[PDB]
Amino acid sequence: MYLRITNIVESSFFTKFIIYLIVLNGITMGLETSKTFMQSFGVYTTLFNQIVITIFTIEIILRIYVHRISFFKDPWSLFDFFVVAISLVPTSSGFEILRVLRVLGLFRLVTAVPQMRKIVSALISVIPGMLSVIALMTLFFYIFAIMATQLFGERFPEWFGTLGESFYTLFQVMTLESWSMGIVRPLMEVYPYAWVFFIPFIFVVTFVMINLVVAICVDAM
Amino acid sequence: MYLRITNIVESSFFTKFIIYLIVLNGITMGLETSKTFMQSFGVYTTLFNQIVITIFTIEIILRIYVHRISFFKDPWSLFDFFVVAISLVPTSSGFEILRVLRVLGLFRLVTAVPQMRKIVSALISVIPGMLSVIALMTLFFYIFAIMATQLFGERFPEWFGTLGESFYTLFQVMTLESWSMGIVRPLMEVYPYAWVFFIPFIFVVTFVMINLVVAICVDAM
Amino acid sequence: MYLRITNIVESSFFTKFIIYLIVLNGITMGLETSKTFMQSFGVYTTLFNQIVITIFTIEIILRIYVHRISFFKDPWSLFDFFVVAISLVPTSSGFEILRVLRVLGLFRLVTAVPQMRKIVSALISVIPGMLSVIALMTLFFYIFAIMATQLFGERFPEWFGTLGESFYTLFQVMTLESWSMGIVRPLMEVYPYAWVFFIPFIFVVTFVMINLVVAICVDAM
Amino acid sequence: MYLRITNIVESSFFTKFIIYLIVLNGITMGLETSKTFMQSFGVYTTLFNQIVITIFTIEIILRIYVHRISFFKDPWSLFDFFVVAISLVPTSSGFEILRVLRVLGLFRLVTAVPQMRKIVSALISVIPGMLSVIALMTLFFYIFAIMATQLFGERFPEWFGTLGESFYTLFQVMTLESWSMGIVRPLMEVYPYAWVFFIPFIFVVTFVMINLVVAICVDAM
Numbered sequence A, B, C, D: 001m002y003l004r005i006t007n008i009v010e011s012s013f014f015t016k017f018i019i020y021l022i023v024l025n026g027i028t029m030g031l032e033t034s035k036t037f038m039q040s041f042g043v044y045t046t047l048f049n050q051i052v053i054t055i056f057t058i059e060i061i062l063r064i065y066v067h068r069i070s071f072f073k074d075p076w077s078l079f080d081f082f083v084v085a086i087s088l089v090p091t092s093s094g095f096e097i098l099r100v101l102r103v104l105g106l107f108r109l110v111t112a113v114p115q116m117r118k119i120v121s122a123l124i125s126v127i128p129g130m131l132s133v134i135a136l137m138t139l140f141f142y143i144f145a146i147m148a149t150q151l152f153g154e155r156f157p158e159w160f161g162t163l164g165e166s167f168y169t170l171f172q173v174m175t176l177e178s179w180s181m182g183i184v185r186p187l188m189e190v191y192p193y194a195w196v197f198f199i200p201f202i203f204v205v206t207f208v209m210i211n212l213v214v215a216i217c218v219d220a221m
């Protein structure tokens, strides 16, 4: 009977149908946002969603028997699996965080549809030749986040009171958002040489970013 | 009589004269801005504009007989047509929006003048090899917009209360404008882990943008 | 006697001496900033500056006789000439604007020193292959500045009340500084669809900028 | 006895052990941040750090005898030396700044570990072909900083009252952070033409930055 199901799963119909449900589920997730829609089609959608998750679980089971070990060595299948699994965890209990993670299922449209797979794949394959720089950077933040914490945390708890608060603030400085009016001008009211810390940090972190980008451009060419 | 008009329309004079009116109309559209100018040359300009639109309709009609079906398969002509048409719709009625859309007529100067066409044409030809990434991105926003709405909309109606309000805010976050001081720092006063939603969102949306640009550079070569 | 001066002007000494004065003048311009310095070396510097301008005028005269027509066909000499001329206009009269323009003389260090000339020259030579895009852009701002003025000027005079105010505000939007929190969120309190005007404007103006940069990168390669 | 130590220092063990201490020291420097941790493991950590600095000084001494003059002509060793030296300066006296500079020791992890060296080395090698543009820029800031001081310092002491205050503000304008809402819009309330100073400054400083980046991309190829 193995081959009987394999010619179902491997069919065009099967894929087209799933892709069809992804888009339907996606559309319905956005309608589930409208307070108006939910007082009308309230029960309608509550059932429609328990229906779709069933079809998807069936799909992932069928896909598993047709593929066995190959299934759990496909990044895309694993994504489909974990995403369907999250959706399976009961609507209540623990925190509601899981209920929100459901909408990550709509990334199945990247899985189920080729060409989408293609771009995601092209985008991701660029990451490996970055990890040496990403590591350098992370070490860099960590060194500066520790300095910032012990230089500015006492008088500026909100922004630098904690290693993590300093990571957060430095990230903001890196994105250059309000770094002068919001952070360094206030800081200099107490610590007039604070600029000696932040101008260099901005130069280095900016410089590295520019190189990181150059990398990706020259290497693709 | 066909050829009699065709040697008019196709002449050097004809185009030079239209290009002349474009610039004349354009200049006059900026003077129609001055509150001072309109209390003086008020009626003067009101007539000058009704004249120009006539010459332009004549122009588009003459251009149609000389070109027939070819006219309506030329992007530039279609633009010229639709732009003259918007201008034809009566000054009153409906909304005043149309009255504003008239100034889009000055993009004719891109049509009537070569070299302008050339650049616009080059800029546009880059769009096709982007639609997959633009598509990816749009899906991405949509997934994150739906999550933000159900995670932050209750306590932050202005920014996340609505799927579209969430779209707008996320776009702003993408441009990185006030994203920490204006949005995430306030958000964290209620949801201390909000950063888990926005730092990743920023990385992904930035990363993709950086690639989107790389694309255009290497591919142009 | 022509050759007598030509072997002065064309000497290394001559150039080295002028470059020496540029740097001295430059240093002294920054000291002329200190309120402390000016109550001490007040008269000292007032004379030192009238001295330097004399030596420079002599220099530009000597350079002219050794070069005649070639002098006024050298961009660099013309700069040196006009910059020395501005410095010659009496300290008083008209407005003080001229007194400030003096410090532009320190760009003589770009003239008098090669290698500096080289970079300025490389940087400028990139401009010609941009004017078609710069023109497109300027037309673009002009069309949108006029729309913004007649759409938002009434209720938002400070930002959009004038064609120029609209140019200014749109430039700010283009640099993406406070565009949402500072301009478009306030605007939407009155005009809820204002986003239909600014999101497109941001896309187009951003898109063009990215291409403008691609241009310069691919063309150099 | 020379070779006896040389086969220690040059061993795989030696480096692995140092790299181990770097990471151990590094981790412990972040725990020294927790107010909680220090009331518990207070004395524990105070000793652990005096131990590590000893091992590191021994390390740098052993490395010196095995390398002598070659040691002091290796950038990385010089760094390791100066970084260990800063750490040697007593916890008290002068300012506490030195105590903070200790954490710069964690950049050793870049030294002791290859591949890190590799990236840092690649990033740095790009700097030489920039110094002409960095030089141009610095001259540029200096010229505009002096002008801003004498044009805006009187009525705007905080932002332009001082050559250095002007440098800082102009850098902020260069990063484009709050430049219109925070600086030029306020400035124009007194000096309606201030925009003539800042829009050009922004164009030039942006233009140069765009070229600076182009440089690194084409030249890397």
Ligand SMILES: C[C@H](CCC(N)=O)[C@H]1CC[C@H]2[C@@H]3[C@H](O)C[C@@H]4C[C@H](O)C=C[C@]4(C)[C@H]3C[C@H](O)[C@]12C
Binding pocket: B010, B011, B012, B013, B015, B016, B019, B112, B113, B114, B115
């Ligand atoms: C195309 C129209 C007439 C239409 C026709 N059928 O001939 C031409 C009539 C006069 C021409 C301008 C001028 O001559 C030379 C300029 C310099 C350079 O060339 C770049 C562009 C020019 C502005 C140019 C633009 C365009 O070309 C026209 C408007």
